[PDB]
Amino acid sequence: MRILVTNDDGIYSPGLWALAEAASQFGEVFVAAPDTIAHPVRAYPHPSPLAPHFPAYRVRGTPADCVALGLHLFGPVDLVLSGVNLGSNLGHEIWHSGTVAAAKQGYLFGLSAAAFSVPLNGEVPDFAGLRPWLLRTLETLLRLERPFLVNVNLPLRPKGFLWTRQSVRAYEGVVIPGEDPMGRPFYWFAPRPLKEAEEGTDRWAVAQGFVSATPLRLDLTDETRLQ
């Protein structure tokens, strides 16, 4: 089977290649990652970091551009994998995720797709320590009925795996007045959730040390307040 790997952090992200090396254990892997209506898109052959040799291309465009391009240069493709994003994509975050966007693009092109993200801010992810779980997760995903569109989040040091629904919460827009060192005032916008994530939600699962996989939908329509 043939797999297209991309992300939105760029071609030097180690999360990209971790995902590539892990995906290669299941098929021929091809890379198309962003560099840094109709429209021209430049792309250049890129040498894969030193490990198996992955045919790669750095694309002077968006991740969605990379999937498109990738499907043309490496067509045919059976699966589009986006990530591993350096940073989580959970709950309300899924909506505007670039990592997720790329995968959603492959899905719209008729392929099966998945986004992978790990929580950041603070300690760096150990992609060496995550491989076993990327594998287990990829293996699990490949048994699903095609096509599928799944959002995956992995904890820094995972202990299991769970299918999850997206965490959905209400927030209080806490705005706290403040004075900077010079003396200029500003507002500290710091939204806090009105409640802990529920069991069964992606957010809940990563907090518990579980890998999280949420099957996504493409329709944002609220069918109940429609008819």
Q: Contacts with a copy of itself in 19-38 (CB under 8 A)?
A: 21, 37-38
**Burial of 100 by CB count in 10 Å (0-12 exposed, 13-18 middle, 19+ buried)?**
buried
Shortest CB 20 distance to a copy of itself, Å: 12
Token pair of 35 as six digits: 């560099």
Enumerate residues 105-124 that contact a copy of itself by CB under 8 A: 105, 108-110, 121-124
3-class secondary structure for 160-195? EEEECECCCCCEECCEEEEECCCCCEEEEECCEECC
SS3 assignment, position 26: helix
**Is 35 annotated for ligand binding?**
no
- Give the whole-angstrom CA distance, residue 21 versus residue 213: 20
Of 178, 196, 198, 199, the one binding a copy of itself (CB under 8 A) is 178
x-or-dash string of contact with a copy of itself, 130-159, rule CB under 8 A: -xx---------x-xxxxxx-------x-x
Residue 50 in contact with a copy of itself, rule: CB under 8 A: no
**Is 89 annotated for ligand binding?**
no
Query: Residues annotated in the binding site for a divalent metal cation, as ranges?
Result: 8-9, 85
